[PDB]
Design a protein around this nucleic acid. Structure first.
Ligand SMILES: *[PH-](=O)([O-])[O-]
Ligand SMILES: *[PH-](=O)([O-])[O-]
Ligand SMILES: [K+]
Ligand SMILES: [K+]
Ligand SMILES: [K+]
Ligand SMILES: [K+]
Lengths: 850, 850
DNA sequence: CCTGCACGAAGTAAGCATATGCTTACTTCGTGCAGGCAC
DNA sequence: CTGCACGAAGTAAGCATATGCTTACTTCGTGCAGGCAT
């Protein structure tokens, strides 16, 4: 059952043998492909050209087989099906090479291929056992192969001498040599037909096959023995040897070209190398030996086991990985003495988990392995079974405690499940897998009977029970009923409104269940809200729909204006199309008044008063001082950039300077009216919180306890507020009892910066530098944040560039796509040629759009 | 502060007050909706009709408020913002109802609504503080409200007497009540405009608001005191009260009809009650008191806390659930002395996890709560930090050990991570969350530096490292490189073949990575295989493609025949279209020969010999004798249903019975030829394994060790084989050392039945009854399996009906839809009207197709 | 007061990515005639 | 011995479902002028 051989030659000889064997494999692949073409098409079966190609491939396979182990010393310990061929070849008179003597046997190439470390997944098969269509005498062919007679092996069907095929007797007539009567009775049949199978010769002569064949050595009796007696007496020709070697390599490529020609002629498609490998696999899978090799390769790749040890393991377990993983360590050492404990732990995951994660000895682990096969087996076995096995002395203390801990782990890893509660559950239901099954079956009242199984235990165990029990009115029995009827919380949520109403659920309960409180604000009823959530997805996605699609299947235009959040002035100054387009393109009515001109507002259909109110309140203020002029008032606001404060800042003389056509009397009135306005605003902003006000704000933001603890730690509530306004995150975190969830509720934006992966110190630096997180997202640059010590990943997370960077783009180019362009969504729709202009490769653009 | 009130009346009075309050809530909702229309449309702002409707709604809200607590004894302990109004009303001369005295205050309804247990999610708000658009004098309106003067409160704007509004002074002059100088200074301003706000009266009189208003009692000084002095001296009219009570309900319904009329006139859509409730929520949630109500409701529903305790917790913590979940138990007991430990554990999940899952005292849990806020906080904190906190005496022994165990749990729950390795990881990287972060960043060499982090640890920790390291050639460094470059195993798999080749990956490695070994057998190269996998998905979808779409963008017709697995006979007897259609309609060539007629094969283009070979081998056998008749041989096979065994069973006279034209001498010759075949079938199929053969088969299927264990437990290998052939699963599982993974490898089909959730006993019963699982899927019926004791869910799992039953269909109807339509996939495409014919509802059909 | 409306933040919950349970050709395996071509 | 067609399913690749992890994706909280209006 074992195929093995060891290479002892040099590196140069190693490469020589590897190339020779690979070329022989290519030749035998040509043989098999010619056979496939012969049988695949009935027309190709008759073609003589294909038969010559097949015979040429046979000859080249034999020639390459003769060139393996030429010096007869590169291989040792050649084993084929348990038979050690080193000893069998040693006991022969002429000796020879054990490798070539192995290749003439069925599947003998497996040992030599393992000796050369040739990839066995591609099936490097080399067989020289052709009979019916062999252009030579089969026994003579095999003898020439095993004796390495690359000089006598022809490389072309035309070069085939008749003295080797039809007139095979003429080769014995050149050397005579002693002929036995038993061998004469074999030859008297071979003179009739030289291609007679050996079983046919044995069956027609009354003797067995081994007698007719004999040993491949002159000192024996048989056709092999006769050919060995003849071949050994033939002088080694050197010119023919090298001439054949140089020509056969190009001949193989020529034969492959012919094969592709015939394949395109009979199949209209070529026979690629990969297809030939797969067909070799298919033709060989009838024998278990390929599954053994595949299993050994999987053990080498996935688990890093040595080649010989993995190969021996695959034999001893029929190439079943799932079976080796359930075999105890002592049996593995018995079948493979060279196996290491670490290799066994790598292949047997249960053995590793027992020895390492639980500190058991190999024997203590083998106990549980034998009695329960796997960790899943332990999880399937009832606890009382293991207790009985332990108390009865059939299970050691170590193995018992380890198994009980393994069982308890599967339940304690859930929130609310203590050790006593897990033990009580195992008592009531045997094993944890039973508890999993009962939880998936929503057997809520069954589990609630066990002492210690509270609300949190059920919510952690029963998938979806939490979401249903939290709704008012839905009790435990009703939640179990719904989960069993519909089959999980997902199917309860996907259920129709009418059938949920038939179950007795209140409209409020269905609103809370299906999450339709947002949509039931837009539409008056539940059914259409549920239909909208079904068809379009989320309420937000409905808001993003165009005005026309919203008008279709919609109730009112005012509903469309309320959905998109259109202001009163903007909704009454234009039609729905233009108003919604302006709002979703500029965002704020103030932005409409600031970035668009007064004439542009009128052109779109705005009343002069409506167009003036769409303009900022600065416009309505300026026109009210004896009508400065709607055209000029804009340029007044265009200078100070729509800021009433900057209008009062500069000298009235400088105001008549910057803006064209202005009267100084008018210029003085606007500055005097601007200084009058800034005095009115301070009335509402004259409050900074007092001590009691800061105390109450603290009791609101962090609760009574932490508020007065902070008040005691620092000076007073005023000092705490001073620390807050300056974003002193570190100074607040010092106080014992104050953590992130309290600081983040004091310092706006702290939570967001922490979620981005920033340390409190980095978040403090960013908040101090930029003031707020929104200003970080709009204003901050990647280099600016890199000066503050942030990493590129943190920058990408905090700026919102995660989508772009996830598509294999550096943070700098993603920020450039935000700087030169606009939003991430807009980059996904940009033209490909513009991105190619910017300097991005084609793969990067494909990933951007993908 | 506190809003609270207790109901002490009877059930009848309880329902009376509930209905009165709900109708008042509807009236105030009408007020708010009329206010909304005034601002929503500029045209509705000018409409006097909308103003009339608004004032009518105000009058009705006032009228319903007067009917609350009529006997002035249903409510006690009325608290509004901490102020206990029971004692304040007790200390007044006229006494009165504390409920009505609370409602006349802003937000005073909150106490009465809690007293009546009215749903607070719908915002049952009742405010009687209108001024500018009040059709009555505001102070007189409020005084009428607080004294329950439903007789004097008008129900229509027309019924408003001028002596109560414009000429309000004429009502005080009717009774001559004593007036102090300050009240004269108030009346001299109210004579200018009776709707002047009280703040303006205070601004023009120099006094504060509380001075101008005074106490709502005759024995005081203020406008409230004056109106109280006047109203008390008015006799209570009963007839007007009764008439208002009778009319106001239909008046409210009429006003709602008017509101819908005006809304459809100005907005083209009606204002439903649900929209009104949601708008009340949106408009009202701006005050922190509403967030308190939401927090209290979520604490009552999700966590089962008592109403008063949840309200007090929401008050003391600004209605932030997240802050309460991080507040220690002692602070919660400080703010809520009546809170129970179980309630605190239910709201603070970390406190529960500490007390229950870890057995800490409340103080020991509060230690970790204050120092680390949450369990995730403990997981984020470095281990050395907690050790320092413990050594400094700032952290008790119990809390320290609990925190260390919490940290170690997050790492030990992964395969290969012991306790020593988890401790070493916490040493090297501080906290487990940092280890998670390093694993997600694919910092493989960084984690591998820690002692005890082996291959299994990395594969369990680094997402995707397992899939890449298991491929031959890909080492640790290359896997880390790839994961860092592309950003996860998903993006490495989605990468292009060319860029993977640029990384140095062999074609074999890319084939193994992208799972294209199946497709590279069809197509010669990797690029086209990857393109096919991209557009079409899986090789299965490519095999199912029609012949034309495969021919388009396809290579060869022989390739198409090889893709669909078309037999040689079927591919050479017809064209691609008809052969592929026959194969995809019948599956097997034998089925083709059985269900199609000999003439039908010839009509499609089959040679008579080719058509006979497409027919079963039984057909070719019959033709080989005295030519039974290609036409007749079919009818011979139609009798025994293409079975050679039944042909030799019955007497040739019964053979002449079923067939029309038969010669009796011929009838015996075919039966003798049938008996001739049964001798040939038994010659090669009489093999049952001997003892050594059973021993070797066991050594193959369960390995040498388990084989000899089975051999020793039972008699011999023969008995084991006898148990196997009879599927004696339980008796095989008896043997110590034999588990499920060995039986499933001994008894074919055991694994599949176990995966369906079946007990070994149930799997044994099914295997004994039906022989194999394939025969279960085709032959078995739901009632037959229910006779074997299986549940309906197990039946659905084993038959393959999971998809149908998951769509809320019983197993019986799903099996009927598998019987009538063939396969499950075919049920998804059946016509809707046919499903309605079968008896299925429309929702069921929508779920079937969905 | 009343609340639209404009903005910032993470509250919250919707996607995205990863892990987990399960169904069945998605792939390997066993057998049986048929005789093409061997012990 | 190979061919090669067929059925079966401890076998394993997809498929479906549940869960964890980020963000703004979606609700929520707040503050500011001015009309609903103390
Ligand atoms: P056979 O393989 O012994 O000749
Ligand atoms: P409000 O009650 O007039 O100030
Ligand atoms: K409940
Ligand atoms: K701290
Ligand atoms: K490797
Ligand atoms: K056992």
């Amino acid at each position: 059952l074992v195929y093995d051989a060891e290479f002892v030659g040099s590196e140069r000889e190693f490469e020589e043998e590897r190339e020779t064997f690979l070329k022989g494999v290519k030749a035998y692949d040509g043989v098999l492909a010619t056979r496939y073409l012969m049988e695949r098409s009935s027309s190709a079966k008759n073609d003589e050209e294909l038969l010559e190609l097949h015979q040429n491939f046979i000859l080249l396979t034999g020639s390459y087989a003769c060139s393996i182990d030429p010096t007869e010393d590169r291989y040792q310990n050649v084993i084929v099906r348990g038979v050690n061929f080193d000893e069998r070849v040693q006991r022969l008179s002429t000796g020879g090479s054990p490798a070539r003597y192995a290749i003439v046997y069925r599947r003998g190439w497996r040992a030599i291929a393992k000796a050369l470390d040739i990839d066995e997944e591609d099936v490097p098969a080399i067989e020289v056992r052709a009979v019916k269509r062999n252009p030579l005498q089969p026994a003579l062919y095999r003898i020439l192969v095993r004796y390495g007679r690359v000089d006598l092996m022809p490389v072309t069907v035309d070069e085939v001498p008749p003295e080797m095929a039809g007139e095979f007797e003429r080769l014995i007539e050149r050397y005579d040599v002693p002929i036995d009567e038993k061998e004469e009775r074999i030859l008297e049949i071979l003179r009739e037909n030289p291609w007679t199978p050996h079983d046919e010769i044995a069956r027609r002569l009354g003797l067995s096959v081994s007698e007719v064949e004999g040993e491949k050595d002159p000192e024996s009796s048989g056709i092999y023995s006769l050919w060995s007696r003849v071949v050994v007496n033939i002088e080694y020709d050197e010119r023919t040897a090298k001439r054949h070697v140089k020509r056969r390599d190009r001949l193989l490529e020529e034969l492959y070209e012919h094969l592709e020609e015939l394949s395109e002629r009979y199949l209209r498609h070529p026979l690629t190398r990969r297809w030939i490998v797969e067909h070799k696999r298919d033709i060989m899978r009838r024998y278990l030996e390929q599954r053994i090799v595949e299993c050994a390769l999987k053990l080498q790749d996935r688990y890093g086991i040595r080649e010989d040890v993995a190969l021996c393991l695959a034999r001893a377990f029929d190439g079943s990985i799932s079976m080796i993983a359930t075999t105890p360590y002592r049996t593995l050492k018995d079948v493979c003495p060279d196996l290491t404990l670490e290799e066994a732990k790598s292949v047997n995951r249960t053995l590793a988990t027992l020895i390492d994660e639980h500190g058991l000895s190999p024997d203590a682990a083998d106990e549980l392995i034998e009695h329960f096969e796997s960790i899943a087996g332990i999880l399937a076995t009832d606890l009382e079974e293991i207790e009985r096995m332990y108390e009865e002395g059939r299970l050691s203390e170590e193995a018992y405690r380890a198994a009980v801990e393994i069982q308890l782990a599967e339940l304690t890893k859930k929130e609310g499940v203590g050790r006593k509660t897990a033990e009580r559950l195992l008592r009531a239901f045997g094993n944890p897998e039973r508890v999993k099954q009962l939880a998936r079956e929503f057997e809520i009242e069954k589990l609630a009977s066990v002492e210690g199984v509270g609300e949190r235990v059920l919510r952690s165990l029963v998938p979806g029970y939490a979401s249903l029990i939290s709704i008012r009115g839905i009790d435990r029995e009703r939640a179990e009923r719904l989960l069993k009827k519909y089959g999980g919380y997902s199917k309860v949520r996907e259920a129709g409104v009418e059938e949920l109403r038939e179950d007795g659920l209140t409209d409020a309960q269905i609103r809370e269940l299906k999450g339709l409180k947002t949509l039931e604000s837009i539409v008056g009823d539940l059914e259409k809200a549920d239909e909208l959530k079904r068809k379009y997805g989320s309420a937000s996605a409905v808001r993003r729909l165009p005005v026309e699609e919203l008008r279709e299947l919609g109730f009112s235009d005012d509903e469309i204006a309320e959905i998109k959040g259109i202001p009163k002035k903007l909704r009454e100054a234009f039609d729905l199309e233009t108003a919604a387009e302006l709002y979703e393109r500029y965002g704020s009515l103030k932005e409409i008044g600031r970035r668009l001109s007064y004439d542009d507002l009128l052109e779109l259909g705005a009343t002069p008063k409506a167009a003036a109110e769409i303009k900022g309140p600065e416009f309505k203020f300026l026109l009210n001082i004896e009508g400065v002029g709607p055209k000029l008032a804009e340029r007044i606001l265009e200078a100070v950039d729509y800021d009433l404060e900057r209008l009062a800042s500069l000298n009235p003389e400088e105001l008549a300077e910057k803006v064209e056509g202005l009267g100084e009397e008018l210029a003085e009135r606007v500055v005097y009216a601007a200084r009058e306005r800034v005095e009115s605003r301070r009335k509402s902003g004259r409050q900074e919180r007092s001590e009691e006000e800061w105390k109450e704000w603290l009791e609101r933001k962090v609760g009574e306890g932490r508020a007065r603890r902070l008040i005691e730690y620092f000076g007073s509530a005023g000092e705490v507020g001073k620390l807050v306004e300056n974003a002193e995150v570190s100074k607040l975190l010092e106080v014992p009892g104050i953590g992130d969830e309290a600081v983040a509720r004091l310092v706006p934006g702290y939570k967001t910066l922490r979620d981005a992966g920033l340390t409190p110190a980095e978040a403090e630096r960013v908040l101090k530098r930029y003031g707020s997180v929104s200003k970080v997202q709009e204003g901050a640059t990647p280099d600016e944040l890199r000066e503050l010590g942030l990493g590129d990943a943190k920058i990408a997370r905090i700026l919102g560039l995660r989508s772009l960077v996830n598509a294999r783009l550096d943070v700098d180019t993603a920020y450039e796509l935000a700087r030169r362009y606009g939003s991430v969504s807009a980059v996904r729709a940009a033209p490909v040629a513009e991105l190619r202009e910017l300097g991005l490769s084609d793969r990067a653009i494909a990933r951007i759009a993908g």
